[PDB]
Chain A
Amino acid sequence: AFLIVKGPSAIAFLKQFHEKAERFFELLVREGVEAIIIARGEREIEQAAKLAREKGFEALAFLADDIIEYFERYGFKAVIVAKQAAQKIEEKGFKNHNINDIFELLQRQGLRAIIAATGLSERELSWAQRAAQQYGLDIIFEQDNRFKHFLEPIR
């Protein structure tokens, strides 16, 4: 899976993954999230939501029809999940290369932190932590390396 749910070089960039590129660009602009949650897929999420809410962050969620109740229950501006059964969702009322640069796009619209949720593989945690470093974002999770991204701001 790899689709979003809501409810300029930026254009040349988004295009790579052209009319819905501009649409799912206005996504990132309108709300302008302050936080992205990264999870596996449900107690993990309730935490992260109010952990993020602890800093009053309006947030997006990323993970790999429960997905529709996350909106009421958590207040997300958007969810990104990772065939083609998206049509079911659209009805119900919900709409070489460096893919990591999307972080820079979100940052310019106001992204401030990543929040890593429980159960992420080590692979995923270091990837989220590399991104916090390289895009100057905060990342929120036993010791020193909880704040690695601040201790070693240049990678």
Chain B
Amino acid sequence: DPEKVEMYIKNLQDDSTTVRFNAAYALGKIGDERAVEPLIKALKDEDWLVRFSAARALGEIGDERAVEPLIKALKDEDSSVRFSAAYALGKIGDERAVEPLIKALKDEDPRVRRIAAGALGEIGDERAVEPLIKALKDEDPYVRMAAAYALGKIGDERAVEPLIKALKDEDGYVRRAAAYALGKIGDERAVEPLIKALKDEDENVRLAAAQALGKIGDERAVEPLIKALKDEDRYVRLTAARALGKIGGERVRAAMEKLAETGTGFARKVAVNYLETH
């Protein structure tokens, strides 16, 4: 409805703060390209929510023209606006956002650093790799987590040994994220540190370790995973069982044969069923 877009467009210059940000929101939802340049202008409104909302709306229209102005909004005095700008750019996906996002890895607001790491992950540009490896050292656990998620998604081998060390983190969220990222990268050097992680206090860590070992598909995991079938946590158990099927072969078909014979409980059940299949 062109008549509505235009009205919200003029609404961008209203005197009411509320009318300005509600107009930038609505334009964002309509998603019409004609609003891009007027929204580019709102990125400098005296009021932060208006700016926040202009940046968000541009993330949504997805027009590459918003990129340089959004790169500027990354330096906004207000941390909400910077968050909204980093989110908008990761969503547009334009490689020009890359070095500015890398700079936002050092913002004083820990949310900005976090969504910067995420935006980087979404773009997939290998230049983010070493800076994201720095961020595994961040004072903030969520930032450390975000960085490992972004590294797993990027898939660059250089992330591996820094991710291994993150399996040693004090926070169970980062440990969970490091294991997940290692499973996704699928480098065999993770196989041994993940086997340890199967004995973690946090059951979210054990779950991800097991899953990660299933993806990796290396055979040294079989017996450590047979054991995890006796795990107190139900989800750790089911996942260990999933992981065993993913690593096919006969070595596991032989662990499955003895287990059908000398096994009890869930562990016996997956043995017969696996054998029933293959």
Which residues of A are interface residues toward B (Cβ below 8 A)? 9-10, 12-13, 15-16, 96-98, 101, 104, 107-108, 134, 136, 138, 142-143, 147, 150-151, 153-155
Contact = CB atoms under 8 A, between A and B. Distances in A.
A29 B21 CA distance: 22
Contact of A153 (B21, B25, B80, B149): B149
B18 A16 contact: yes
B26 A13 contact: no
B25 A97 contact: yes
B44 interface: no
B interface secondary structure, majority: helix
A13 B49 contact: yes
A10 B102 CA distance: 30
Contacts of A12: 16-18, 21, 47, 49
Contact of B21 (A9, A136, A150, A151): A9
B121 A9 contact: no
Nearest to B25: A98
Nearest to A104: B80
Contacts of B177: 150
A137 B177 CA distance: 17
A34 to B, nearest CB: 13
Nearest to B123: A154
Given A12-B17, A13-B18, A138-B142, A153 B235 contact: no
B26 A96 contact: yes
B51 to A, nearest CB: 9
